[PDB]
Amino acid sequence: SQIVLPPHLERIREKLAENIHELWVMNKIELGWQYGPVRDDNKRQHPCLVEFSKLPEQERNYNLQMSLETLKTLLALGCHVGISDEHAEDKVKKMKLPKNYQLTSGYKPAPMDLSFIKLTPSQEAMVDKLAENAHNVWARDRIRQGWTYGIQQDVKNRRNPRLVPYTLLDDRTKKSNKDSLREAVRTLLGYGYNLEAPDQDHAARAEVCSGTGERFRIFRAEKTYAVKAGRWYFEFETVTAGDMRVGWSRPGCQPDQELGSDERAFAFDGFKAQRWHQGNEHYGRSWQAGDVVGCMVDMNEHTMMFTLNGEILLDDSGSELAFKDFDVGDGFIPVCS
């Protein structure tokens, strides 16, 4: 709403409106519609074909204000647009189209050709957000109208399966509205209005949006199975690849604290290729999905070793010991976060 329209867009948006309307009825001509006083599309007749003046004026202002809304959305999404040259407005180049195949209205639709114009990948990402916003507008309007999502379409109960997020929308509708708004942007460029799409802004939510404040769950064996001497081994399998830590913990490990933050646990974070005990040090490489991590402790000479898919992991130096020396204490139990 707060978007203000620059004077040249104010000059140009009306002719964009009726030019894309003539285009738009050319699309329904491709679909096979013909002009008729009746509204029913099933009998192939629809009065949207004729020019804007003889169009139902409520459909006319609907099309006009949706054109303005689309260009204001272009403005609001941070995509600046300039004027290429006065030649783009001076020229009125036209494709020849047979009158019988064209509409009844005298004003002949076809704009400057699509082949001459080129659409950049940034420009296509732009019309992606345009289709997103158009779908949101349609959904919000029907929601104030009272319509509600339903798997089976029901006009009587105002239930429509198309009231879904655009990422979840059906590919047919996505491609249809994508191409319509794409061709609208194509005409915008054809009138010599080069819109400079801003570069994609790198924003990562980092998966942190977990349900409730629970950030990680720690799984450990019972404190009674603590080992105080000998050689021990167990395997940890990574179904996914992500923020996990595996290793050995003392009976006093706190469930709320992360493994390796304090002295109670000795862990290996392969997601960052990071070893953890009272801090983080670089050790080993990163795992992928399906990798099996072998955790070995020798509690006679107080060493710990890790293997990823069989090969022994190494720290920055050539040493194979994740933790070279540590006290016996109360023992160690397998643990994973």
Ligand X SMILES: Nc1ncnc2c1ncn2[C@@H]1O[C@H](COP(=O)(O)OP(=O)(O)OP(=O)(O)O)[C@@H](O)[C@H]1O
State the Cα–Cα distance between residues 312 and 146, nearest whole angstrom.
63
Q: Which two tokens stand for residue 120?
A: 């950049």
Judged by CB, which is closer to ligand X: 33, or 332?
Answer: 33
Give which of 283, 255, 252 is closest to 267, Cα–Cα: 283
Residue number closest to ligand X, CB atom: 48
Report if residue 154 touches ligand X, rule: CB under 6 A.
Answer: no
CB of 120 to ligand X, least distance (A): 26
Q: Which residue has the tokens 């655009």?
A: 166
CB of 35 to ligand X, least distance (A): 12
Report if residue 48 touches ligand X, rule: CB under 6 A.
Answer: yes
Judged by CB, which is closer to ligand X: 28, or 129?
Answer: 28
Binding to ligand X in span 61-80, by CB under 6 A? 62
CB of 102 to ligand X, least distance (A): 18
CB of 48 to ligand X, least distance (A): 4
Q: Sketch the per residue contact string, 102 through 141, with ligand X: x for CB under 6 A, - otherwise.
A: ------------------------------------x---
Q: Which amino acid is at 234?
A: F
Binding to ligand X in span 168-197, by CB under 6 A? none
State the Cα–Cα distance between residues 229 and 332, nearest whole angstrom.
9
Judged by CB, which is closer to ligand X: 48, or 265?
Answer: 48
CB of 10 to ligand X, least distance (A): 24
CB of 49 to ligand X, least distance (A): 9
Report if residue 59 touches ligand X, rule: CB under 6 A.
Answer: yes
Q: Which long-range contacts (CB under 8 A, 24 or more apart) does 169-177 make?
A: 169/135, 174/131, 177/131, 177/134, 177/135
Q: Which amino acid is at 129?
A: K
First to last CA, the chain: 48
Give which of 226, 244, 242 is closest to 333, Cα–Cα: 226
Q: Which two tokens stand for residue 163?
A: 């009231």
Binding to ligand X in span 196-255, by CB under 6 A? none
Judged by CB, which is closer to ligand X: 22, or 269?
Answer: 22
Name the 3-class secondary structure at 307.
strand
Judged by CB, which is closer to ligand X: 25, or 333?
Answer: 25
Judged by CB, which is closer to ligand X: 56, or 198?
Answer: 56
Residues recorded for the chain: 337
Number of shown-chain residues binding ligand X (CB under 6 A): 4
Give which of 304, 222, 208, 214 is closest to 260, Cα–Cα: 304
Judged by CB, which is closer to ligand X: 62, or 219?
Answer: 62
CA distances from 292 to 68, 84, 286, 288, 295 (A): 57, 59, 12, 9, 10
Contact residues for ligand X, defined by CB under 6 A: 48, 59, 62, 138
